[PDB]
Swiss-Prot record, chain A:
Residues of the full protein shown: 107 to 205 of 224
Taxonomic source organism: Saccharomyces cerevisiae (strain ATCC 204508 / S288c) (Baker's yeast)
Ranges in the topological domain labelled Mitochondrial matrix: 28-36
Protein task: Assembly factor that plays a role in the assembly of the respiratory chain supercomplexes (SCs) composed of ubiquinol-cytochrome c oxidoreductase (cytochrome b-c1 complex, complex III, CIII) and cytochrome c oxidase (complex IV, CIV). May be required for late-stage assembly of the COX12 and COX13 subunits. Required for the generation and maintenance of a normal proton motive force (PMF) across the inner mitochondrial membrane (IMM) by preventing proton leakage through an inactive population of CIV that accumulates when RCF1 and/or RCF2 proteins are absent.
Residue ranges of the TM segments: 1-27, 37-67, 79-98
Cellular component per GO, a single term: respiratory chain complex
Name this polypeptide is given: Respiratory supercomplex factor 2, mitochondrial
Curated annotation (Swiss-Prot), chain B:
Protein name: Cytochrome c oxidase subunit 13, mitochondrial
Designated gene of the protein: COX13
Residue intervals on the Mitochondrial matrix side: 1-31
Coverage span on the entire protein: 13 to 75 of 129
Species the sequence originates in: Saccharomyces cerevisiae (strain ATCC 204508 / S288c)
Compartments where found: Mitochondrion inner membrane
Family the UniProt entry places it in: Belongs to the cytochrome c oxidase subunit 6A family.
Length: 99, 63
């Protein structure tokens, strides 16, 4: 139901989730200060991209959760585009024959 | 021979920002030991059970 509705927002949610994981892990790594700021940045970033690559293999898991919905896309709405581009040539051909 | 060459150039040595320098000098040691402990813990509990699962995935595709 919801699955493709935010699975074409797929690579726009995971970069936001990366930014969320780094800028959220930043306060948890910065609340206990004795390291210099660079070590806090590299450890928060080290956690955050483990999160984004785990979420990205969950991304391919969703990708084949989701297209047992309708098989063989990358063409079955080039079907859509070409089918109504076709008979929108039809809508012009008629009333230039009869207009 | 200048007259004023032998007077001290700094005056009083500060005693709390030397102690605070030395406690940070000896506290980043203890925190670095604990940080190294938990990071070898992470690097062997997570990183080698990652190469251990992807080498068996890539041997199949290298075949």
């Amino acid at each position: 139901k919801f699955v493709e509705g935010l699975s074409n927002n797929k690579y726009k949610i995971i970069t936001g989730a990366w930014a969320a994981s780094l800028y959220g892990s930043w306060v948890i790594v910065n609340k206990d200060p004795i390291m210099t700021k660079a070590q806090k940045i590299v450890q928060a970033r080290m956690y955050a991209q483990f999160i984004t690559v785990g979420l990205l293999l969950a991304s391919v898991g969703l990708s084949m959760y989701e297209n047992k919905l309708h098989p063989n896309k990358q063409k079955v709405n080039e079907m859509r585009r070409w089918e109504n581009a076709l008979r929108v040539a039809e809508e012009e051909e008629r009333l230039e024959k009869e207009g | 021979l200048p007259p004023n060459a032998l007077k001290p150039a700094f005056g009083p040595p500060d005693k709390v920002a030397a102690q605070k320098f030395k406690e940070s000098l000896m506290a980043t040691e203890k925190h670095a030991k604990d940080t190294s402990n938990m990071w070898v813990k992470i690097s062997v509990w997570v990183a080698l059970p990652a190469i251990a699962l992807t080498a068996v995935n890539t041997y199949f595709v290298e075949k």
